[PDB]
Amino acid sequence: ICLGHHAVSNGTKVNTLTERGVEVVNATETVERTNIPRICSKGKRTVDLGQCGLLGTITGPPQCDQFLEFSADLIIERREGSDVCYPGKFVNEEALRQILRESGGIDKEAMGFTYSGIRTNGATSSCRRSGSSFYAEMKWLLSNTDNAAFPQMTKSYKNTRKSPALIVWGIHHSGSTAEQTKLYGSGNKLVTVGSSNYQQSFVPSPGARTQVNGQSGRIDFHWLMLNPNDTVTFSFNGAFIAPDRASFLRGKSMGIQSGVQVDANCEGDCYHSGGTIISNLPFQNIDSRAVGKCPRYVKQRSLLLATGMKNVPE
Amino acid sequence: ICLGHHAVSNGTKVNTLTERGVEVVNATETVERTNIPRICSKGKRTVDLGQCGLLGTITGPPQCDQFLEFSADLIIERREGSDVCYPGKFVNEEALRQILRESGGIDKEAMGFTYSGIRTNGATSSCRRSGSSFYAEMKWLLSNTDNAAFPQMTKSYKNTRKSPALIVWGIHHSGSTAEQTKLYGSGNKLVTVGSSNYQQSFVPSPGARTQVNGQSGRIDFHWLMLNPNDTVTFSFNGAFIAPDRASFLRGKSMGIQSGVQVDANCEGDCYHSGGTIISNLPFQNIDSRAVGKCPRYVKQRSLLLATGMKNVPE
Amino acid sequence: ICLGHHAVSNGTKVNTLTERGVEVVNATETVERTNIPRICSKGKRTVDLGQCGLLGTITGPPQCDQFLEFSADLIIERREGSDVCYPGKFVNEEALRQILRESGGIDKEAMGFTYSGIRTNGATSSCRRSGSSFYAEMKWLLSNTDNAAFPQMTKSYKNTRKSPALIVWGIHHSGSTAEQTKLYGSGNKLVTVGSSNYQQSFVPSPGARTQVNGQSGRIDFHWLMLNPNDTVTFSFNGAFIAPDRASFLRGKSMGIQSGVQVDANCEGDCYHSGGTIISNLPFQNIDSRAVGKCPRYVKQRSLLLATGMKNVPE
Amino acid sequence: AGFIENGWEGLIDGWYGFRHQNAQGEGTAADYKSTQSAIDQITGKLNRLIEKTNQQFELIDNEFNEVEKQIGNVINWTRDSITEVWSYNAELLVAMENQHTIDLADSEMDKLYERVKRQLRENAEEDGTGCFEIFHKCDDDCMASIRNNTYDHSKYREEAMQN
Amino acid sequence: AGFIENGWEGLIDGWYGFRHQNAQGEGTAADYKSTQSAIDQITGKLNRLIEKTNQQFELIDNEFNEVEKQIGNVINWTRDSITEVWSYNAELLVAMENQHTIDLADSEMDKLYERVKRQLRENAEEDGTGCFEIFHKCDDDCMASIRNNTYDHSKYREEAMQN
Amino acid sequence: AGFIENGWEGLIDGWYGFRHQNAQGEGTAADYKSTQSAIDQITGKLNRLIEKTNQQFELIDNEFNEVEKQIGNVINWTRDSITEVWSYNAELLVAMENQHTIDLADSEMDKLYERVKRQLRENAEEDGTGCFEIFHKCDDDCMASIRNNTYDHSKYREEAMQN
Ligand SMILES: *[C@@H]1O[C@H](CO)[C@@H](O)[C@H](O)[C@H]1NC(C)=O
Ligand SMILES: *[C@@H]1O[C@H](CO)[C@@H](O)[C@H](O)[C@H]1NC(C)=O
Ligand SMILES: *[C@@H]1O[C@H](CO)[C@@H](O)[C@H](O)[C@H]1NC(C)=O
Numbered sequence A, B, C: 001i002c003l004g005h006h007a008v009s010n011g012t013k014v015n016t017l018t019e020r021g022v023e024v025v026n027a028t029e030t031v032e033r034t035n036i037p038r039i040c041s042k043g044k045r046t047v048d049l050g051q052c053g054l055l056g057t058i059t060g061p062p063q064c065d066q067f068l069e070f071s072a073d074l075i076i077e078r079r080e081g082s083d084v085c086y087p088g089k090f091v092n093e094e095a096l097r098q099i100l101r102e103s104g105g106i107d108k109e110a111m112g113f114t115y116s117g118i119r120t121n122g123a124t125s126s127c128r129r130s131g132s133s134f135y136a137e138m139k140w141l142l143s144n145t146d147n148a149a150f151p152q153m154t155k156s157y158k159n160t161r162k163s164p165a166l167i168v169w170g171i172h173h174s175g176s177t178a179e180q181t182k183l184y185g186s187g188n189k190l191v192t193v194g195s196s197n198y199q200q201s202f203v204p205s206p207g208a209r210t211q212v213n214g215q216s217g218r219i220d221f222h223w224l225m226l227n228p229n230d231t232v233t234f235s236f237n238g239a240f241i242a243p244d245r246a247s248f249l250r251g252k253s254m255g256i257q258s259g260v261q262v263d264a265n266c267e268g269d270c271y272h273s274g275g276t277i278i279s280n281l282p283f284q285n286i287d288s289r290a291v292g293k294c295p296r297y298v299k300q301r302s303l304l305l306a307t308g309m310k311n312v313p314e
Numbered sequence D, E, F: 001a002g003f004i005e006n007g008w009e010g011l012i013d014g015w016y017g018f019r020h021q022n023a024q025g026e027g028t029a030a031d032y033k034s035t036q037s038a039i040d041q042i043t044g045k046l047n048r049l050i051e052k053t054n055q056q057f058e059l060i061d062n063e064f065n066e067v068e069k070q071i072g073n074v075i076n077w078t079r080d081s082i083t084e085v086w087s088y089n090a091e092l093l094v095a096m097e098n099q100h101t102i103d104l105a106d107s108e109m110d111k112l113y114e115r116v117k118r119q120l121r122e123n124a125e126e127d128g129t130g131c132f133e134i135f136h137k138c139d140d141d142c143m144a145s146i147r148n149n150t151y152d153h154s155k156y157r158e159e160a161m162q163n
């Protein structure tokens, strides 16, 4: 009576500590390469920003009118999205973006700012709605009738909630000094924003910029997190885009950047720009910048794990 | 004559490469979980900052009067500590904090700044000592009698040592423009600080801030490292908190943030906010932000290492 | 007939999982310690910057006159190099340095800026060539004859290529306010630089600095990357160092900092300040900041890998 | 898989088996115990390796609006370092697991051979190529008792001794 | 721990031992050499693993005054990556060390069995369950010579041969 | 390297060999197969470990003009963490590879001994110290057939049986 083991005609070559190319019976793959070219969001509150930029949801351009108080577990950014209608730029862009991606949505709240002796409905052609409008969450502060002195005002807002608030104001840099005097008046302007953790530091800078959206002026948006029971203050004398409402974070969420369609038929916790990585394997070779609960990215295209005995054919 | 091995009634289950839950005879723990709720500082020069902030030791508020020239191997920050008496804020806070944590203490040195035609003892109610005082290491530069022109002065200091110096000045932002003219005079002010590695860039910004410590004004502290034989210079014309003395690093130290008591009976090289991790195990599961010579943090609560043979009971 | 194995008189001690100091027959080293005190650049286009600073190649001080359009696969920085002739400083130094290290060289291009009613050949004593000169890539913009009003001009440049351009301008801070009025005129100056990704923010700050190179004034260089078909714009009214030519990246390269000689006889892909690490071993203990294709740095000085059987002498 | 020259392609019933040749005829069978042990250890190894973490990593870069170049180079540097670490760990992990798998199967085969030699004490010989030169006429029911581990070593002792 | 069905709970003197049964009486003892070898290898393994580094890591965050959100997210991202790396390394380390420990003890038991079979050449038989069917009457002093590795295989040869 | 008391310093021809002592004279030789297998496995291990990556890492710090202190402390912190990871991986890697190397050579020696026992079935005895008490007069050509694996176990059977 003889003893022996099984074998196959064509085995699978694997790598060991001593040799590279040892042919065994069976082997499985450990590095994932199959990618689903969709955003698997089955069972998740998903907000596709589309043409709306993530930061715009705080200021409210027209394309973000339906995202002023969104709520989601997964946030998708699109490359065609824009944060601004009037040509502008946020200070600390990626910080505020990373804050909003894991916010679970935003909840707006009227800050309660009243004005006296100053007209407050400044509009532009690039912020089109019914006609010439502006940011839905902001107030372009101007002068009474036209060229006049801007009364040096100061307005405060106390965070009357239990969670920190998102305060966003704006500094307008007109197309020329004469246009700054036309909108606010002559003289050096200044915008002071104060709290307990903040201390800044604003004065406009008029000049000619390249025509973006057909406009030569710019608007610099700024933000801070107001702690509970703490008060924010603004001492300004012209060139001020005041905040109408403040934002409050709802909870937790995931923020991704993608260019593929949304699919509620599949579920996945690992996302990248090209789709979703649905796999049980511990490693993947699709995208190194994949976010969520992903397999750890490796450079190897394939790593065959031996699941059987060494194959010794006759 | 038969051969065999020993066994026990109740073994210890461990994990292997092939199976999870293999019962062996003896096993030891590799992940540390026991924490001492104290700061073990046996044999270490320890400075408990308490109500004094780490940065305040450079400017010298009242609560830091006994920390102007401290010396320690271990520095402990407390959450009740404050860097300022007059409401203010440092620029590059965490950079200077990280510099001071591993400094081994500070050594002050009179910079030798003399003034002519300017009164130099500006005080405030929030900096209480015997009466109304100010920062022990700073000089609030004002005008002669009251509203008057601030002479545009320039003062230089050459680092006459072998180690870099810590230069800290201040920019005062008063509660209003009229108060800035009351303290320094009308006209645009400017503060220039120059050296070989520095090139900045200062002009005040008056306005109304929220009353912190009963004060509406702010003071912005700034700092730089003056290399040996290199000179720092200041060309200012108002709103200047001049440095009286410069700081020099003593050597090396450790900086921690904690809320537990100090204990000189135990010794440890791994600290966190909740106490000291005294262990020989290679891994710990107490705090991922533990500093010093710590076991490497892991997510697993326990990882039993088999120290004996597999237990095969009858 | 007996069976046995070979042995040697003096074996090599190695470390295992169970014991430390097991004497085996043969063993090889895995941690590299031999260093070549030269820069092995065999078969690589190498540019030794020498006394020329990496950033200077964009502005063009005298010591960088032969580096205005360099091209290399390996860039070497020297500690005696200087970015400036007139005492100045770049904003975002290390960012632009890291951009230029992997640029494969730079290609200059005339931006096409013409001026009317303004003299454009401002020189200094510290920028020595034939006599008093300036940066070869810049234009020190001044006034017509002497104290006069600087016409508020605006100049634009459209990136007419397929790769992003490097735009570098300068902001002059003179030794005093009266010298700023002497060079540009009285009144508040401003320099606006605009595009699609940029929004800044410049106004000079006159004052007295420490005499570096025999000069009390400073020049602050700034830069941005102009995307293809996008336009950059400048609205300035004094104190402006205009760019003559823009830079375009050639391709890819490696940037190192060293103090040893260049050697084209040896080849290596791992560089550090002390030379080149030429080794096949997976680990090294020379320099942790080694760049290129290096062995992974470890703290151990030596790790002997057993290449033979355990040595059991008689 | 050492002194056994090659495997049996016809053995489709299990990983290890018996191939006998007596006076009745030819026959092959599979040993369920050793095979089930091997596939249980390898199966548990797979279940230990087919693990995806529950740790969530947020987006730190920006594909649509590139972050600042310095912090971007730091992020790319750190991510590349971690990628090197996980590539090394994956390579060494797969190599070691394959080694222990092959040596594990070899150990199971050798243990089966050792226990089959333990059943036949002096009633059979060893040839050196994984067979047992059985010293007496072992019926198909006798070899069936060998596979079932019920072979009486003493009831066939003297018959297989004098040969 | 293979063909030996189970361990001896009464063996409190060592890890491996001898349990004899002759004409004089019953008796159990411990083999100091194999046990001391096993506990020396495992002890050295522990001494190799009970290591805490001498590398000092400074405070990079701030629990009382949170740093900037961007650099804070980069720091949290890097720290979480390193935490994943050390969790994986700890898991795989403990698993591999336990495997090599169990297989090491099994190897020591099998080596003891092999050397005890080397002492008794043809003067005893093997049963298959870790015992030696000794072919002659071995006194308690004879088994004491077996445990002391002083058994003369030739002075009891012919007596244990004809049985 | 267990029951064999020590190695042969005079064996300079290979890693394993035969040292015989018959009626003709003394002699030592080397077994090319086992030695070549061992040096092939260890050689392949070296070729698997003598690897330098193709991943390029750029300069993230600045030795001539120090970067900002905060980002510099973050960079130093990350680099120190990665250095700890690679130091641990190198230590554990070398230790495990040395262990598997020593146990591999021991396995090759034991396999050679096992196959030499497989050639001599009942024509020789085992002493316990790695020798074969050969029961018949084996000429130098007979031992040369033992080293060449051509020893006929049956043509010398009865002569070595009655002794
Ligand atoms: C071989 O491995 C694959 C890996 O998934 C598995 O699906 C398959 O059932 C295995 N087959 C055998 C015969 O083990
Ligand atoms: C906030 O302020 C309100 C009223 O001033 C007080 O009732 C409440 O306890 C405060 N909460 C905190 C957390 O300070
Ligand atoms: C079991 O392991 C623990 C681990 O520290 C040790 O203290 C104890 O002495 C060990 N006991 C035995 C019997 O090995």
Ligand SMILES: *[C@@H]1O[C@H](CO)[C@@H](O)[C@H](O)[C@H]1NC(C)=O
Binding pocket: B228, B229
């Ligand atoms: C610093 O300056 C003094 C006097 O100017 C000189 O003696 C000394 O050598 C200098 N040291 C260095 C390091 O430059």
Ligand SMILES: *[C@@H]1O[C@H](CO)[C@@H](O)[C@H](O)[C@H]1NC(C)=O
Binding pocket: C026, C027, C028, C029, C307
């Ligand atoms: C011993 O190892 C070294 C390592 O490089 C090798 O060069 C040498 O040839 C080896 N010698 C033997 C006899 O294996």
Ligand SMILES: *[C@@H]1O[C@H](CO)[C@@H](O)[C@H](O)[C@H]1NC(C)=O
Binding pocket: C228, C229
């Ligand atoms: C750039 O502009 C030119 C002319 O305006 C046009 O022909 C070209 O397609 C443009 N390229 C891109 C990439 O926009």
Ligand SMILES: *[C@@H]1O[C@H](CO)[C@@H](O)[C@H](O)[C@H]1NC(C)=O
Binding pocket: D066, D068, D069, D070, D071, D072, D073, D076
């Ligand atoms: C980091 O790598 C990505 C490619 O994955 C590249 O697009 C990006 O520009 C890199 N970051 C920087 C700062 O260059």
Ligand SMILES: *[C@@H]1O[C@H](CO)[C@@H](O)[C@H](O)[C@H]1NC(C)=O
Binding pocket: E066, E068, E069, E070, E071, E072, E073, E076
């Ligand atoms: C990093 O994690 C800690 C919890 O350990 C959290 O308190 C902190 O806010 C996080 N950092 C940022 C920037 O959110």
Ligand SMILES: *[C@@H]1O[C@H](CO)[C@@H](O)[C@H](O)[C@H]1NC(C)=O
Binding pocket: F066, F068, F069, F070, F071, F072, F073, F076
């Ligand atoms: C980082 O370490 C280097 C030494 O390798 C030191 O020179 C440098 O100053 C350190 N970085 C900081 C920010 O201190």
